[PDB]
Symmetry: D2
Subunit: 315 residues, 4 copies
């Protein structure tokens, strides 16, 4: 009866998720992959690390979905990268097929799980995974906003020369051009960034550049690493979501969540602040937008709609 | 060369400070008191607890100030309680005498320390302790606002049904009638409390009652315990300040800090948000007040002035 | 569905248990006492500390046993101290009456709990509490040996100048003259203390003195504090036991456990190494004694028998 | 003045070291590599993860050694893998050249560092790195034994069904055929494994198989992963060593250490238990061997001698 965490995909993010789940003593971990040996090896390596910090957790790797039976949390990173010669449709086609298999596995073996999707393109993959698995919409979420929040917080803390603990970033929507930052609901110690510009703690230009840097943040890591994308911050972000579920913390975190009318939207996964507790997505915090924000949010949702239409077109 | 933390006063708060410093692996601890046996016993008890969690720290107790030599941080709780038959002047008279002795001990033995005063009445005792010790004003601070922030955060998190991690409370000034809350710079996930009332997440009345409950918070604990005042939250609050110094975190925390013109004030210790790092109080965040806040802050400073005048009157 | 920890007794150890349970994020906490106000005040103080470290836990205080309903773990410190004018029989008489009330409360309200008794005299109180509550014998244990282990580990680590993390102490039986140390199964980095004497890392005399100091350890703290007994190490020790249950860690810890024939003993609570997991006391590790150890253990069990007979005599 | 940790090599182990150093709040981190972009990207990714857990640490990546200036700890993983078409001499030739460059960089820029070598073949690379850097022999160590200890502890804990926290493994020498296990100084709760066989908690055959599995442990991970070797347990192991230095914990850990006559050996790096504190390798624990162990240790040292001779032959 420790909690059981199944990690579907045992690649860069999945290994990191597994390591964090151990260090944080969140429970037992099953790593799943289609590449045999990989999840077993990473599982055993992490298991062998455990006596150094003293965490007691069972680790195992598998390529059969029976291994995930009764998982409390399932975190999905399974899929393929968009190689330079691949279309968007190609990628969606491929990773939709992966979501199909993953959804079937969760449906059969872990129907009571809280599912956190990470696989790109996230706002479509999470939507697809919920549909394929049939799980309740409040029990399937996507990680995206926490990562954007984390990047922006790092840039802010560096700018102001203050602890990351005292910075808050408010972001909705998706990544990149689909991100909807509210600098007025972003703060240092409760003071909004817009007021910090008035105080002269920063400048409008520096603030705008930090917002843009957050939009571009994923690509900035790709451009440095060259062989892959970011994994430490993505994994940390999803573990925060998982921990909030497992420990019923009721964190308020921006995640891709199924909207039943909130923000004027019905039937789509959109990045919004949600309370995560033992019942999954328990409430959506719907803020009041100004005009600039309404228009940014509308673009962002249209982007999601266009990708969902591409999914239906390819499946 | 581990950091050295000296705790001047080994009573309710001082024991708790000592326990937290161990658990958090902040360094070696010296407990100091005039009651012989007390600091030695608590030190040894905590030392004996250490193998259970695995923290390596030296613990000792003393009643001679040579024991605090070279302390990196000194946290002062030494003093007496205001027994029902004691005046304010009586208390100040008594605890000023204690600050005199403590200041002399720090001056001689730990002149390079970051000093955190807790002893009441705080805004006067911290002012007195800086004067008696001669330490640089940026290296002597008082704990008060963090405690108020913590209480208000607890009440907010309970009200909204969210994690304490996603609530921010902005408080300046002192405790009780001297507290200067800014609900507009208090937030859930970046959203100000004033906006949460507009969203219907709470009500104005409930918000006002939580502010009042924070004002009264110390007395609320006294009224429950009957034999003494709060100690767990006070100790946690001061340890946050200490940790920010020791780990150069540059937390932004409301503390009683010496103002050199900020907030229009020169030569007084006033509760304000400060960045705490390896150089002590490194910057004061001076916010822009609305009218209600200016007047509340002016009352609060006048209160401090009146207590400083009472000190001079009694010493 | 967070775990629920009920702390029966909200005095020195009980407050400390409550604080540790928060810091370690073990779950929700209910403090129970007959002195109204005390558990409510300590609960609220700890709750108010929580936003400083970011632990999400509900805290409450009560003087009605309905408050403990559904507790996963119950830790019992309720009782009175042996004031200088009180007999052993007096104390047992009094604290047996307390165990009667506590056992009735657990029986009615938390029948599925893992119960950890701390109240003295421990080997009798734990036996009595199991009988009064009717809970399964594997779900009721007493804390004693972990504390002795912790003290001895502290003394060893100081002697050898090594980390507390690399010292192991093996103790069975009770405290004081009833303690049964096995220095040959006590180690630094796996090397037994008896071999460390041969290596010249210490001396036989120093080793014997550390054993004696452990026997006397509780009194050593009393003699320093004067107003009460140890509480930081006692609380840490019991929390280790609780955590092993709650997280199914299967720690091997010396505890007062009900023996069903192990060590040649049937029907008594005796200090022995036990594996603690989600099923309670899951296995007893029965070591093979040398002659000196057999005789020490036999004395220790006879001591327990004599105290159980005194209980029956007074109840 | 936070501690500064330089990680020379930003590959599989180096990234993991960097992540752990953040999570454990050990200090600022510089990742160094010859592949430009890699250390910068991993540094930035980890930095961006920090606001999720709240660790304050500066992260940077570099390919110039000036970046490591004033490092308190330097952990070396730089080097190349032994590709299937490469000799032992080839590998040594190559990685000796890497140690030459790394040693020069440490000499010039971080002469006061505690250096932890990980690069294979470890017992030669650590010896070479000390010679190239000129640092004091007590300030240069190799990680190997902690990893073996950790693997064996995992296997033991699984065998006995107990917490990893209560298992101790005693290993000297190197990996594989060069490992020198002492099962008699390996324990569960202080009870030696040899006694646990007598108690019937395991069997001689199972114990022997766990020893052999530890010998083969690195290869077991390679055989599962196929693309590389273990990294989570290796990184955890070295971080334990680093933390012991940085926090002056005086852990007793099996590491490749320069022997000045201990174990009968002068002038070689050999795996032995050492106390690690703020002065580096502060003491070597020299145990007394039985005959089987003496012969195993002699083989193991001869193996080291043969590799040192191969180094001199290739350099
Ligand atoms: N949501 C976000 O904010 C965010 C941020 C970063 C990365 N990502 C996305 O996360 C995903 C994972 O990234 P990564 O770096 O771990 O990738 P990776 O390529 O290292 O890992 C993916 C793993 O999935 C496995 N896999 C492939 N097909 C599978 C199947 N049918 N079933 C099970 N497993 C399968 C692969 O074998 C591989 O081990 C990618 O799609 C990436 O774009 C998302
Ligand atoms: N700043 C705040 O927000 C805040 C909040 C709570 C409590 N307080 C104050 O903190 C202080 C400590 O509270 P507590 O509950 O620990 O009190 P306590 O009475 O338990 O402890 C005070 C200790 O100081 C010792 N002492 C007395 N005179 C001394 C001297 N001359 N030198 C050294 N030690 C001496 C006493 O022996 C005692 O052990 C009190 O003044 C209290 O009002 C402040
Ligand atoms: N087992 C060990 O190794 C060990 C070590 C140290 C202390 N102890 C024992 O632990 C016990 C607690 O010590 P402490 O320092 O916390 O004591 P304490 O006196 O501070 O606390 C005891 C609490 O129990 C309460 N209480 C009294 N009667 C009660 C009842 N009928 N129902 C509920 N609550 C009641 C009291 O009001 C008090 O708050 C003592 O018996 C002590 O001897 C055991
Ligand atoms: N001691 C042990 O117990 C143990 C256990 C496991 C692995 N290892 C060894 O640890 C080492 C690192 O393993 P890994 O998985 O991280 O390897 P890796 O190949 O992922 O990383 C090595 C890094 O070193 C870099 N590098 C190469 N030449 C360099 C130079 N001249 N200067 C600076 N950087 C350079 C590479 O670019 C690469 O990023 C390997 O030699 C491996 O065999 C040791
Ligand atoms: Ca632990
Ligand atoms: Ca609406
Ligand atoms: Ca530790
Ligand atoms: Ca101004
Ligand atoms: Ca947390
Ligand atoms: Ca038997
Ligand atoms: Ca923190
Ligand atoms: Ca010798
Ligand atoms: Cl270890
Ligand atoms: Cl323990
Ligand atoms: Cl805080
Ligand atoms: Cl977060």
């Amino acid at each position: 009866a420790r909690s059981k965490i199944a990690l579907i995909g045992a690649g860069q993010i999945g290994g990191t998720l597994a390591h964090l789940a151990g260090l944080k003593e969140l429970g037992d971990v099953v790593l799943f992959d289609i590449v045999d040996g990989v999840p077993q090896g990473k599982a055993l390596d992490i298991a062998e690390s455990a006596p150094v910090d003293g965490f007691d957790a069972k680790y195992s790797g598998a390529s059969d979905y029976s291994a995930i039976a009764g998982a409390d949390v399932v975190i999905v990173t399974a899929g393929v990268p968009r190689k330079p010669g691949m279309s968007r449709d190609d990628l969606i086609g491929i990773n939709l097929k992966v979501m199909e298999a993953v959804g079937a596995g969760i449906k059969e073996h872990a129907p009571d799980a809280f599912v956190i999707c990470i696989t790109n393109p996230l706002d479509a993959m999470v939507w697809a995974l919920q549909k394929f698995s049939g799980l309740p919409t409040n029990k399937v979420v996507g990680m995206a906003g926490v990562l954007d929040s984390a990047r922006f917080r790092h840039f802010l803390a560096e700018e102001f020369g203050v602890s990351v603990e005292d910075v808050t970033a408010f972001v909705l929507g998706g990544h990149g051009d689909d991100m909807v930052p509210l600098t007025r609901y972003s703060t240092v110690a409760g003071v909004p960034l817009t007021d910090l510009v008035k105080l002269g703690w920063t400048t409008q230009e520096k603030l705008d550049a930090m917002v843009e840097r957050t939009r571009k943040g994923g690509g900035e890591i790709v451009n440095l690493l060259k062989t892959g994308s970011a994994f430490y911050a993505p994994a940390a972000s999803a573990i925060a979501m998982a921990e909030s579920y497992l420990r019923d913390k009721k964190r308020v975190l921006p995640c891709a969540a199924y909207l039943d009318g909130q923000y004027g939207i019905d039937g789509l996964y959109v990045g919004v602040p949600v309370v995560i507790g033992e019942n999954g997505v328990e409430r959506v915090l719907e803020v009041t937008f100004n005009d600039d924000e309404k228009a940014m949010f509308e673009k962002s949702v249209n982007s999601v709609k266009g990708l969902i239409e591409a999914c239906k077109s390819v499946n």
